[PDB]
Design a protein around this ligand. Structure first.
Ligand code: B12
Ligand code: B12
Ligand SMILES: Nc1ncnc2c1ncn2[C@@H]1O[C@H](COP(=O)(O)OP(=O)(O)OP(=O)(O)O)[C@@H](O)[C@H]1O
Ligand SMILES: Nc1ncnc2c1ncn2[C@@H]1O[C@H](COP(=O)(O)OP(=O)(O)OP(=O)(O)O)[C@@H](O)[C@H]1O
Ligand SMILES: [Mg+2]
Ligand SMILES: [Mg+2]
Lengths: 169, 191
């Protein structure tokens, strides 16, 4: 059976765990679909690597909400990208769907919670969903089969190390 | 609103102006929750997607089918994996120790190779915890590695000295796991 996995918490490794699992599925010939919220204005190494293997990526591509500073524009992009999420979540030819940084869309009221719950509950029985992001709604956590919270024991950004291509994005 | 957001931006930008070192870092993925190995390989995939060079040592045998390795290896990611005979048994401890020391020679090579942007040392923590691999060899290799190389170490129960040495540590807490609900290991998910 397909399960729902959540990678949450403030430490590094949520999105990279989701995409390491996608890499794992692609390496066994499974089909993966990907939707990424907020993200898209920076280079994306995981997309560079996986898209040529037939992993469809749909990204919101608006950027940080504290840069865009435009709730309505962000909400419109969230909903448009979500239309891709709902298609994937309805596609029995996909073994796995990644919904990366979905947490914030619910937390900021961009994306109604009920739409997320019913799409997850209507999905094909064999399909696994990986949701990531800080600050995951309790009801998504309750619905999930596996939840790992990445505790931020230490992060190199605190010690003054800049984000670098190939590590941080 | 614009004003509330602007205060966020201002704090993010100030944190950003303060952190200007560019160097290789040590990342450790530890904890009992699922996600350590897969984050390590999501990171390797991210790195390969930007043309970086990755080497991998896995301190467990490669008898199960290995999706990440199936994908990454044809991209020129070198895998070294522990000998197939490894037992974990007290009776075979001398052979198991030698098997661990042997892939570790490849790990030392990688960690001295300036052409490798990233080295993954997957399940290394057990080798030091169970006395197959001396702590001092790991600490010295990591300190002598190339200035621009990142290393990713994974596994439950990581030695305190490797944790002190790391730049970034995430502990994966097993809030829930489908195993406890009777969901069995599946290809593509658990291996
Ligand atoms: C939360 C967070 C996010 C959330 C932001 C949600 C939001 N927009 O409201 C998400 C996960 C969406 C995100 C995405 C990214 N982020 Co971010 N994010 C952070 C973090 C950890 C905290 C920010 C906060 O609100 N305070 C900061 C680190 C920090 N302590 O500030 C990084 C940080 C802001 N992010 C950073 C990066 C690199 C990214 C990504 C490129 C990561 C990626 N691999 O995709 C993307 C870029 C998104 C885009 N603009 O297209 C860098 C930005 C560097 C810069 N010069 O501005 C920071 C400062 C982290 C770091 N340098 O170690 N981010
Ligand atoms: C920690 C852990 C590991 C550690 C063990 C390190 C150690 N020496 O302590 C490492 C990372 C090495 C490991 C590797 C693997 N494991 Co494991 N492991 C676990 C986990 C999370 C806890 C084990 C534990 O605490 N044991 C408690 C007591 C019983 O400990 P112990 O028996 O003395 O420890 C030994 C066993 O755990 C054994 N073991 C661990 N995994 C496996 C897998 C198989 C096939 C066998 C025969 C034995 C075995 O390794 C130790 C040897 O000293 C369990 C799930 C769970 N919550 O129980 C999965 C679990 C045992 N692992 C599993 C799997 C699938 C794997 C890997 C295939 C993962 C992968 N993608 O590579 C490999 C298999 C290695 C092989 N046989 O070729 C599955 C086994 C499914 C099955 N059909 O039996 C489990 C049940 C996870 C799941 N299904 O969700 N594992
Ligand atoms: N605690 C933190 N401090 C500073 N930077 C962080 C922290 N956690 C994650 N990052 C980095 O900040 C950006 C936003 O990603 P996010 O906050 O979703 O974490 P993640 O998904 O756990 O990180 P990754 O994508 O590397 O696995 C990324 O470049 C990420 O590596
Ligand atoms: N808390 C847990 N309960 C049950 N199974 C687990 C747990 N954590 C990891 N696993 C699964 O047990 C095996 C051993 O994994 P390990 O302890 O190395 O964790 P991991 O590296 O975090 O897992 P993955 O490779 O899935 O990221 C893998 O099949 C893994 O998916
Ligand atoms: Mg993320
Ligand atoms: Mg592992």
């Amino acid at each position: 059976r397909g399960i729902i996995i959540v990678f949450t918490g403030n430490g590094k490794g949520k999105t990279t765990a989701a995409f390491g699992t996608a890499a794992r599925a692609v390496g066994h010939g499974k089909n993966v679909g990907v939707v990424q919220f907020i993200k898209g204005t920076w280079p994306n190494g995981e997309r560079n690597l996986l898209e040529p293997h037939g992993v469809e990526f749909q990204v919101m591509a608006t950027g940080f909400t504290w840069e865009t500073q435009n709730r309505e524009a962000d909400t419109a992009a969230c909903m448009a990208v979500w239309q891709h999420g709902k298609r994937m979540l309805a596609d029995p030819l996909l073994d796995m769907v990644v919904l990366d940084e979905l947490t914030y869309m619910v937390a900021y009221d961009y994306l109604p919670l009920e739409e997320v719950i019913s799409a997850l509950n209507a999905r094909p029985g064999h399909q696994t969903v990986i949701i990531t992001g800080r600050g995951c709604h309790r009801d998504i956590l309750d619905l999930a089969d596996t939840v790992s919270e990445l505790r931020p024991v230490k992060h190199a950004f605190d010690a003054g190390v800049k984000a670098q291509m190939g590590i941080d994005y």
